[PDB]
Design a protein around this nucleic acid. Structure first.
Ligand SMILES: [Mg+2]
Ligand SMILES: [Mg+2]
Ligand SMILES: [Mg+2]
Ligand SMILES: [Mg+2]
Ligand SMILES: [Mg+2]
Ligand SMILES: [Mg+2]
Ligand SMILES: [Mg+2]
Ligand SMILES: [Mg+2]
Ligand SMILES: [Mg+2]
Ligand SMILES: [Mg+2]
Ligand SMILES: [Mg+2]
Ligand SMILES: [Mg+2]
Ligand SMILES: [Mg+2]
Ligand SMILES: [Mg+2]
Ligand SMILES: [Mg+2]
Ligand SMILES: [Mg+2]
Ligand SMILES: [Mg+2]
Ligand SMILES: [Mg+2]
Ligand SMILES: [Mg+2]
Ligand SMILES: [Mg+2]
Ligand SMILES: [Mg+2]
Ligand SMILES: [Mg+2]
Ligand SMILES: [Mg+2]
Ligand SMILES: [Mg+2]
Ligand SMILES: [Mg+2]
Ligand SMILES: [Mg+2]
Lengths: 77, 149
RNA sequence: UAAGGUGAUAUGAACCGUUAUAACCGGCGAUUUCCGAAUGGGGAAACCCAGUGUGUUUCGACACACUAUCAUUAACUGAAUCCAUAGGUUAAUGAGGCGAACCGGGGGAACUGAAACAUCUAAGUACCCCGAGGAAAAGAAAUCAACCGAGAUUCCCCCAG
RNA sequence: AGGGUGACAGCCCCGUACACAAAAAUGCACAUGCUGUGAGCUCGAUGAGUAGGGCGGGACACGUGGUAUCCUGUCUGAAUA
RNA sequence: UUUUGUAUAAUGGGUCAGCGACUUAUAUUCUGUAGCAAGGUUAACCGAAUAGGGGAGCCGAAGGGAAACCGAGUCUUAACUGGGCGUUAAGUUGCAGGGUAUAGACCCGAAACCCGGUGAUCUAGCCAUGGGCAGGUUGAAGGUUGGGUAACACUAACUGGAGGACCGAACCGACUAAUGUUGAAAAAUUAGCGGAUGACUUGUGGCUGGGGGUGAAAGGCCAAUCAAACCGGGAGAUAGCU
RNA sequence: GUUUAUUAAAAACACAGCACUGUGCAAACACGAAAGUGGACGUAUACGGUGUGACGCCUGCCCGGUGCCGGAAGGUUAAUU
RNA sequence: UGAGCCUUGAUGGAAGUGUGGACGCCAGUCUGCAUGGCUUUAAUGUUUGAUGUUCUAACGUUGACCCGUAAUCCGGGUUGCGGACAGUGUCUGGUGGGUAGUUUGACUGGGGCGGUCU
RNA sequence: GCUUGACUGCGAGCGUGACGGCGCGAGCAGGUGCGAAAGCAGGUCAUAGUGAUCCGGUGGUUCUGAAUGGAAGGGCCAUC
């Protein structure tokens, strides 16, 4: 499930569009990566499957806060 | 990515300065490895409140006994002296506890030789005023009265 | 409620009943095999095979009840790694499947029309997928107006082919 | 109104108009108890990887147009009455 | 019925009964008719419900100009002797009808295109595990032994028992003919025929699913069909043809 | 040997043999949006693709065209800036 | 290592016994080396891009081991090998009958070929 | 020889087309050339020498211009 654990980003659909303007179904999908984040608050490595962006979100908000959600929302981690 | 530092840390570090560091270096090494922290603003004060409650706080709490010599500005009672010799001139020296024998009942009592003037300590008249070790900065002022017996 | 009654093809038999337990109607309860979500395990549905606790003047064995999975919670346990975490057992709640349309969402055609055809259309239709209610959805302005003023959402008629 | 009864029935039967009914289980209303639950005032605070932007798409009757508005896969990224 | 034309040897119909094709909705115009008339008329909704209320609004009484704008005129042009379009005819709302527009739009009919299911009980290929091949030939390697060589070579008997080896039943195929062809049979019967220890043959079960499979490759096979299976659906696809 | 089950059994397919070509192993290749898997529990005396088609004697010239292989100058050339 | 800024030596405590580099108006004199009673020049500290080594700490491991776990999955952990490569998202140029949707006129003494089309 | 009538605005009234359209035209207004003048000239003896609509470009023009003033874009005349 190409799905960003932090941000909710899943794949989306659109068209392609030639010069001839031809519509053809396509998919956009999240730049996902799955990373080993160091918590320390847990002295452990939680490894989330993330989108660069999710990563930025973590880099901002803060890991302990992100992990806050998910748990807050039932998710594993 | 900005973040402020904890430990030294090369090409930037400074026990708490404000550096701007490449994304990865930080979320991958600087932290989750204690050596810095997201400049979360909540922090730029959290770690500036130091640069105030310190570098202007405990650098002023250094002035609580000016020159240490406060009310010793009228010379001290000459209990004994510091010695003499050579029938007129001088000859005998100050033991590793003998410039107190005179000022030997004023402030507090101690006994060590933080020698300050690495000379043969001039032998002449008697009453001099240099400084001696009173701390990491200031000094002191008193005199010396010989004994005629 | 009652003087008639034991559904029908479908008689007959043997019976029930007539002033209140015949029958008949309705409220509430009892019982409710097996299969089926099917849930002890299995399985070619309605069959096969267990385990654990129970129970028998005949306490072999054969009856009765529990034992699926998943989630939340708790208790007891408990690794690499000593603390922890993971893991494991148990217990209590809950879910699970079914089924009209209407509803919200994920995805989403082609014939066809353009008197061919690719932009365009058919259409966000058909269809598949998930979810929910009695309705759903939406909703109390970073809305419109236009220098006057309106004052959420929904629905209808005009505006206007 | 209607239906039936040996042919077409207001008065033969069942009904209809009308007026009546529940030991029970339930629905909705109110009035009350229970556990909750928070009410009013004063002083505050006022939604950031967000708005905006590049790219690619999508949605707006609007087919990138001179094209506002909205959503966002990708890269970025404010002000703070 | 179609045709320039059909007794026509061109189409359709064995016959009778029943059924079977220009419809409905909303717009829009015209005609007929009715009402009111420089006016006609209400929609939603309200309702005292076919009344009444509601005149939002629509159409009409004013055009010209792209427009600003002007206005019984106006536009053209600097302006037109002038030119064009206008001013001189009554609308409007029901009701019935004739056309059109959107809708399956008079009825029936494709070959197909798209979506979602069902199918390897026929067949193709593969996997697992099992079964089957009467009878009769040929007689490879190798081996023993004699003969033979300086020793090998070589040679004779014997022994052995290979092979997509031979002949031929079962079994598997299907080259020719005849019959049959409203069949005994939706692919056979009868006489002949190729293989028959193998790239053999066959039972049970399993796997591969539709632009997909499988194919010793014919476009072959995938349940009597296959240049794209069957079923349901889009669906009354479309049919300028009959 | 195979084949057009049902008008073609052949000179078509296949075959051992041969050649070219790709592949250093998490191979190439192939089913698959992926995970997983075949190749292969193999490893260049192997694996795939293509052609030829026992065996004998043999397989000449042509690299312009098309296809493919190699080329660290120059010209031309995308997003981006 | 291309270019900017900061600077300490160039354009804008005397005389004599002694030295590397040179547009030196063509024949100088210097720019420094020793001594002796805002614009044309060399290296530092830098700031900023390019190239190159190596590191480890993202990330890969279809090497070995530990545990969950009597397990050819998975997860965690340790170790080894790699390593900011590879790979993957977004954008972009090329290739791309592998797949797709289609087009490929009429007239015509039948059609096609030829011819013709205002 | 002198010139720019290969002029601008229009146009009674004809032709010829299903239509889109094409064609001929004296005359009026402004302005111009030639000629002493009467006068002739809105191309070429005539009849071929061509391409609708869309979209877009260029010049001109306040006609329009989504709160207002502007602007963008649209219209109109010329033209590609
Ligand atoms: Mg069971
Ligand atoms: Mg079961
Ligand atoms: Mg089509
Ligand atoms: Mg069409
Ligand atoms: Mg609700
Ligand atoms: Mg106001
Ligand atoms: Mg706010
Ligand atoms: Mg005829
Ligand atoms: Mg006749
Ligand atoms: Mg006839
Ligand atoms: Mg044989
Ligand atoms: Mg034989
Ligand atoms: Mg036979
Ligand atoms: Mg089978
Ligand atoms: Mg068949
Ligand atoms: Mg079908
Ligand atoms: Mg349809
Ligand atoms: Mg049809
Ligand atoms: Mg043969
Ligand atoms: Mg055949
Ligand atoms: Mg044959
Ligand atoms: Mg090979
Ligand atoms: Mg051949
Ligand atoms: Mg040959
Ligand atoms: Mg094609
Ligand atoms: Mg033709």
């Amino acid at each position: 499930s190409r799905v960003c654990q932090v941000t909710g980003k899943r794949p989306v659909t659109g068209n392609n569009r030639s010069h001839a303007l031809n519509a053809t179904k396509r998919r956009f999908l999240p730049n996902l990566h799955s990373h080993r984040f160091w918590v320390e608050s847990e002295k452990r490595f939680v490894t989330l499957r993330v989108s660069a962006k999710g990563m930025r979100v973590i880099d901002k908000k803060g890991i302990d806060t992100v992990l806050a959600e998910l748990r807050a929302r039932g998710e594993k981690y | 990515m900005q973040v402020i530092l904890l430990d030294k840390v090369a090409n930037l570090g400074s026990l708490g300065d404000q550096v701007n560091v490449k994304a990865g270096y930080a979320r991958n090494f600087l932290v989750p490895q204690g050596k810095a922290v997201p400049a979360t603003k909540k922090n730029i004060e959290f770690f500036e409140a130091r640069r105030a409650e310190l570098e202007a706080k405990l650098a002023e709490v250094l002035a609580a006994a000016n020159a240490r010599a406060e009310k010793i500005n009228a010379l001290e009672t000459v209990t004994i002296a510091s010695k003499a010799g050579d029938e007129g001139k001088l000859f005998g020296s100050i033991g590793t506890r003998d410039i107190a024998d005179a000022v030997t009942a004023a402030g507090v009592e101690v006994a060590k030789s933080e020698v300050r003037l690495p000379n043969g300590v001039l032998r002449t008249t008697g009453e001099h005023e240099v400084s001696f070790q009173v701390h990491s900065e200031v000094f002191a002022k008193v005199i010396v009265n010989v004994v005629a017996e």
